[PDB]
A paper describes a structure:
Shiga toxin (Stx), a major virulence factor of enterohemorrhagic Escherichia coli (EHEC), can cause fatal systemic complications. All Stx proteins consist of a catalytic A-subunit and a B-subunit pentamer. The catalytic A-subunit, which is a member of ribosome-inactivating proteins (RIPs), has an RNA N-glycosidase activity that cleaves a specific adenine from 28S ribosomal RNA to inhibit eukaryotic protein synthesis. The B-subunit pentamer functions to bind Galα–Galβ–Glcβ-ceramide (Gb3), a glycolipid present on the surface of target cells.
To elucidate the precise manner by which these shorter peptides bind to Stx2a, X-ray crystallography analysis was performed with co-crystals of each peptide and the Stx2a holotoxin, which were obtained via the soaking method. We were able to determine electron densities for AR4A-mono, R4A-mono, R3A-mono, and R2A-mono, and X-ray crystal structures were solved to final resolutions of 1.80, 1.80, 1.90, and 1.75 Å-resolution, respectively. These structures reveal that the AR4A-mono, R4A-mono, R3A-mono, and R2A-mono peptides bind tightly to the catalytic A-subunit. In all cases, the common Arg8-Arg9-Ala10 motif (numbering reflects residue position in full-length MMβA-mono) interacts equally with the Glu72, Tyr77, Val78, Asp94, Ser112, Tyr114, Thr115, Glu167, Arg170, Thr199, and Gly203 residues present in the catalytic pocket of the A-subunit, whereas the Arg8 and Arg9 residues of the motif electrostatically interact with Glu167 and Asp94, respectively. The amide group of the Ala10, but not its side chain, interacts with the Val78, Ser112 and Arg170 residues. The main chain of Arg8 of R3A-mono also electrostatically interacts with Asp70 of the B-subunit. Overall, we find that the binding patterns of these shorter peptides are almost identical to that of MMβA-mono. We found that R4-mono, AR4A-mono, R4A-mono, and R3-mono exhibit greater inhibitory effects (relative IC50 values = 0.387, 2.27, 2.70, and 3.68 µM, respectively) than non-tagged MMβA-mono (relative IC50 = 8.14 µM), which was used as a positive control to compete the binding. Notably, R3A-mono and R2A-mono (relative IC50 values = 89.6 and 132 µM, respectively) also substantially inhibit binding, albeit with efficacies less than that of MMβA-mono. Although the precise mechanism of the detrimental effect of the C-terminal Ala is remained to be elucidated, the presence of the amide group of the C-terminal Ala may contribute to fix the binding manner of the peptides with this Ala, such as MMbA-mono, AR4A-mono, R4A-mono, R3A-mono, and R2A-mono, to the same orientations which are clearly demonstrated in their crystal structures.
Residue numbers in the entry:
A (entry chain A): 1 to 242, 257 to 297
B (entry chain B): 1 to 56, 60 to 70
C (entry chain F), D (entry chain C), E (entry chain E), F (entry chain D): 1 to 70
G (entry chain G): 7 to 10
Write the structure that this text describes.
Amino acid sequence: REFTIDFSTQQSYVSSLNSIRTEISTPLEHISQGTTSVSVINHTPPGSYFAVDIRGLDVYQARFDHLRLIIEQNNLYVAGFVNTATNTFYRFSDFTHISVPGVTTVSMTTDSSYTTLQRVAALERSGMQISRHSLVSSYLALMEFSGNTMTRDASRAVLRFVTVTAEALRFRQIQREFRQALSETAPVYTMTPGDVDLTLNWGRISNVLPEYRGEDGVRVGRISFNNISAILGTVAVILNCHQPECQITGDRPVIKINNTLWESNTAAAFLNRKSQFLYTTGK
Amino acid sequence: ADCAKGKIEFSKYNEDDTFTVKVDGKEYWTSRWNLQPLLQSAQLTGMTVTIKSSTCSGFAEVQFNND
Amino acid sequence: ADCAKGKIEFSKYNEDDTFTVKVDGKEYWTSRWNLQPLLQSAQLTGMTVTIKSSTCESGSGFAEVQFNND
Amino acid sequence: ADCAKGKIEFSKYNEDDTFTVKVDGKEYWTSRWNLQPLLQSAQLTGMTVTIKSSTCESGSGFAEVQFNND
Amino acid sequence: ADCAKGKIEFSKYNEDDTFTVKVDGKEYWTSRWNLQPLLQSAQLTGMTVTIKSSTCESGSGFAEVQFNND
Amino acid sequence: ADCAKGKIEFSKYNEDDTFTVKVDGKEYWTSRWNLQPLLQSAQLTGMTVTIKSSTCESGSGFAEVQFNND
Amino acid sequence: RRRA
């Protein structure tokens, strides 16, 4: 499966994302309005991937058109990037099980974790700026890249492209906030702490939302949703939790408390305190 | 004896540092401080509690069961 | 007396190791350390608490509180 | 020995302030105060525990327990 | 004085028996054990905390903090 | 030294009342009582914890740990 | 931790 994400306009960009979601996921019965839903990634065998061709960095122009992302389908992780001009797939070290036919695969020493990427990039995601201009710069940095080890500029490029492709696929909130940067005003998208927290809690959210049945709220660690419009405005695509990211510990996805659906592990993590006087004096 | 079985319908911290819970229409108190979080957690997560005691007043034995 | 009933609007640890909660527009503090995490759990889960005290003026102390779910 | 591994089927605060859990069909008590909330939280989230003791018969005591992510 | 308002970015317990939280890019510490569960729960639930101190300079101690669900 | 950074794979309450966590394939124990619920909360919510100690071999003790949301 |  090959898809284009076209950055030409907010319309082309959101259309591209929506088409991908439609093809790879199925709406949750209870979190769906029209064709706008929280969707569960359809099961594929491990190692299944789809390709994303990056288009439209220069609005409606057939240039800057040699970057492809390889995305593991079950988890939406970017496994690496393809320079289609050189026919070279630069693959992160945690995706040696992803085989792409027809390309030269460069297995890199660098793993795809945000911790590693942010270190190599010297760039924290919280406060990271993305604009059309810096996506063109990212494109150029990835096309110039060669070798088995991520450089600083190639890592910054991957941070930006992953945010605006895979993370936006997962999170309507990121799609909505970033797409402003594609308008003729060309403002800057700044990733917020909240955006980052959303990405970090994707597996936990995925384990909780399939249990939602119209409760007045949803609480998953630091994440709060207060109505269905908050859910839909924030989340678009979740893992199929019925992946190792679905479960932390225990076997109880949710507890309903006072008409709010809680991740059970969150409640357990603040209901495990002993008597405060005894705690504080038992030093 | 099983003084009461059911969900905690309310809990209360009392001025004498005891803790009251109301289960199956009956109120009971405990002076055991460590029962205070244990009971409130049971109330929050919907556990069935079984208050046990010789005289079914105060208690210091309670079973917790998930719902 | 029942000074206040409702959800905790905020809680606050104080430098004298007392603990304040705001319930139905009124603030009350307690020096019972055992109430600090219980009140926080109540806050977090949207429990209805009933502050009980002999003085119900805002900013007064309390050491008796009922916890109710919905 | 590893006497029982599995979810806590029930727990019980005891009149002597010990704390009982039933794991893998067998009951074990501990006098370790700090285990009480830790075990109850494990119980509420269905977290697997491993009771470790000198004797594994129901009614045995333990002072060692492992909280697993199974 | 309000030193920092935000969600707790991280917390850390230090060998010298102090407990650091990072809020809105600034770090503060408390040695009140009372505050360790309160703060960690606030961290893991995404509470908005307000660190209060008469002196709000960086790396300084605190023992007053407000907890808000939002 | 920054001995280990990762999720808590298991935790164990030990006979000597210390508390052991497994992080990044290595076991570390702490006698700091304040840390026991904190560590379990980190395990329950899959926090990334950083164990800091003067020795990092498995079976080393620690009294310093950072709790991260990332 | 979280993979990209």
